[PDB]
Design a protein around this ligand. Structure first.
Ligand SMILES: Cc1cc(-c2cnc3ccc(N[C@@H](C)c4ccc(F)cc4F)nn23)n[nH]1
Length: 282
């Protein structure tokens, strides 16, 4: 019944590809509604996001809206929507399977150790950062504000070389630690509010999945950031990369880069041997 607009065109539930329910098979649980690995009847491998049957009426419309929103993107750095199963219960959104999993656990689980000497290098992190910036620029070019850019909301196509990172998810619960001053004080959101969050995600990537402001509470962060406090560089983080983070966290939004420039700056970093030859901490 409710419709939705993006890049000039309005659409509704009717435009979603409704796949029969008996053609969908679940398998293993992947994470928390919850997400399952699935199969659609060379059969097609999918992820299935479920809406719990025990839920309010508000929850279902939020769910419906998400299928519409994700179905409407066409970009290689945003997880594809395969289809939906809304007419049988529980309701399903079918999504591109991302064998690399969540970006945060990936960083946490593949951190170099004497076990995995160089299981990952500086250049691999920059490529992950560029990928998400590319998806964010597409969002920005289409006047869509994500509001929750974070490693926990990014996914990887595979574990090994050639992995591609894509955006995969859309009071006290607000992710304060990823929000610029104008977001949490005034509720003002812009493409520049996504820019701030991307800087934090950038800290997330180069810290290899450490929680931001590791010893601060949400309120301490709110007071810290307002007073002009910013995070220190991740361990061993190259200066050119840290410089992108600090520019993303400029206090006035008009002084933060748009995503075209951020993309431009990340690519420049990948052309700098002193950046890409820096060893990750073990
Ligand atoms: C949509 C999709 C998810 C996977 C996948 C593949 N391996 C995993 C492992 C955990 C996971 N956790 C869930 C809760 C999740 C994490 C991050 C995110 F951005 C979205 C998301 F649903 N998801 N996951 N492939 N495709």
């Amino acid at each position: 019944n409710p419709n939705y607009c993006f890049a000039g065109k309005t659409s509704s539930i009717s435009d979603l590809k409704e796949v029969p329910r008996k053609n969908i098979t679940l398998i293993r649980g992947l994470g928390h509604g919850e997400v399952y690995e699935g199969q659609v009847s060379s059969p097609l491998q999918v992820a299935v996001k479920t809406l719990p049957e025990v839920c309010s009426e508000q929850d279902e419309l939020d769910f419906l809206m998400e299928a519409l929103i994700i179905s409407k993107f066409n970009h290689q750095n945003i997880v594809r929507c395969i289809g939906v199963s809304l007419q049988s219960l529980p309701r399903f959104i079918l999504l591109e399977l991302m064998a690399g999993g969540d970006l945060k656990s990936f960083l946490r689980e593949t951190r170099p150790r004497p076990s995995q000497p160089s299981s990952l290098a500086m250049l691999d992190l920059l490529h992950v950062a560029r990928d998400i910036a590319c998806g964010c620029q597409y969002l920005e070019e289409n006047h869509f504000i994500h509001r929750d850019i974070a490693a926990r909301n990014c996914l990887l196509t595979c574990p090994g070389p050639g992995r591609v990172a894509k955006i995969g998810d859309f009071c006290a619960m607000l992710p304060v630690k990823w929000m610029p001053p104008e977001a949490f004080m005034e509720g003002i959101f812009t493409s520049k509010t996504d820019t701030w969050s991307f800087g934090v995600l950038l800290w997330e990537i180069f810290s290899l999945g450490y929680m931001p402001y590791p010893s601060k509470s949400n309120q301490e962060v709110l007071e810290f950031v307002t007073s002009g406090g910013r995070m220190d560089p991740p361990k061993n983080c190259p200066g050119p990369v840290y410089r992108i983070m600090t520019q993303c966290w400029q206090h006035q939004p008009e002084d933060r880069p748009n995503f075209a420039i951020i993309l431009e700056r990340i690519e420049y970093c990948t052309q700098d041997p002193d950046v890409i030859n820096t060893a990750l901490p073990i």
